[PDB]
């Protein structure tokens, strides 16, 4: 449970998104900046603008991995294996901060794809980000 229809709204989801995913990363954070302020300590560096190329090249990145991850629901643990450990682990990136970042993209998500965005699109995603977070937290675990 990575479960088939889960997987099959997840990618359909994912899929309406496209080249927007870029967009959504950084609206994401744009976003957890201002709405779960304690996260902002991770982003020392980081001209969190407002809307700032810092966030942007970042926002770039949290969705390119998103996007992979969408496209191979079986082998996340071998998939995230670089990034499970940046985060976990070297980053050390409170778990109570993942559930954070993930609500804010289902906002985001859910703000832009309300036609397509169903309790079922809604649940399969929730869950997917759900299946994200538990991989990149393994340190822990």
């Amino acid at each position: 449970v990575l479960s088939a229809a889960n997987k099959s709204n997840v990618k359909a989801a994912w899929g309406k998104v496209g080249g927007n995913a870029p967009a959504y990363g950084a609206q994401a954070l744009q976003r957890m900046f201002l709405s779960f302020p304690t996260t902002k300590t991770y982003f020392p560096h980081f001209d969190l603008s407002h809307g700032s190329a810092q966030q942007k090249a970042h926002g770039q990145k949290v969705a390119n991995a998103l996007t992979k991850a969408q496209g191979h629901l079986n082998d996340l643990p071998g998939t995230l294996s670089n990034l499970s450990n940046l985060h976990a682990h070297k980053l050390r990136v409170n778990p109570v901060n993942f559930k954070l970042l993930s609500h804010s993209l289902l906002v985001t998500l859910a703000s832009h794809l309300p036609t397509n965005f169903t309790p079922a699109v809604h649940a399969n995603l929730n869950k997917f980000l759900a299946n994200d977070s538990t991989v990149l937290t393994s340190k822990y675990r």
Partner: protein, 145 residues
């Protein structure tokens, strides 16, 4: 509670908010997305389907009032946990939900309004609405007895 400049913003944007299906939906999804909350309502009948649960006249009515009820929060948003006292009552009473499910539920309404609203549910309105459920999640269970 916030800038009055902030209170200003949710007061105005609460109100364009349609109460009937902004809680049907928010009750609605809470429904098949936390599938376990679904406990507290044998209370209506059919949550063993997404179609079902939503529509389900009952979990409909439930949100109607599970919602300007909240959203009658504010007026006062303010003094107190006052307000809400009350339905605490009821909540640690004979249901007995986690202060935890207050906060989903609060988080389901922000997915609602984000997508009904859509480009206006803004990281600053997103922002302040956040507080608001942080607040209303919170009195309801500080409340415990």
């Amino acid at each position: 509670m916030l800038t009055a400049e902030e209170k200003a913003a949710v007061t105005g944007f609460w109100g364009k908010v349609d109460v009937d299906v902004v809680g049907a939906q928010a009750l609605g999804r809470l429904l098949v997305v936390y599938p376990w909350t679904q406990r507290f309502f044998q209370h209506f009948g059919n949550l063993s389907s997404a179609g079902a649960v939503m529509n389900n006249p009952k979990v409909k009515a439930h949100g109607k009032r599970v919602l300007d009820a909240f959203t009658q929060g504010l007026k006062h948003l303010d003094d107190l946990k006052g307000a809400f006292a009350q339905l605490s009552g009821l909540h640690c009473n004979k249901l007995h939900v986690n202060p935890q499910n207050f906060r989903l539920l609060g988080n389901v309404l922000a997915l609602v309004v984000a997508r009904n609203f859509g480009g206006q549910f803004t990281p600053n309105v997103q922002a302040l609405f956040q507080k608001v459920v942080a607040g209303v999640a919170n009195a309801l269970a500080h409340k415990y007895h």
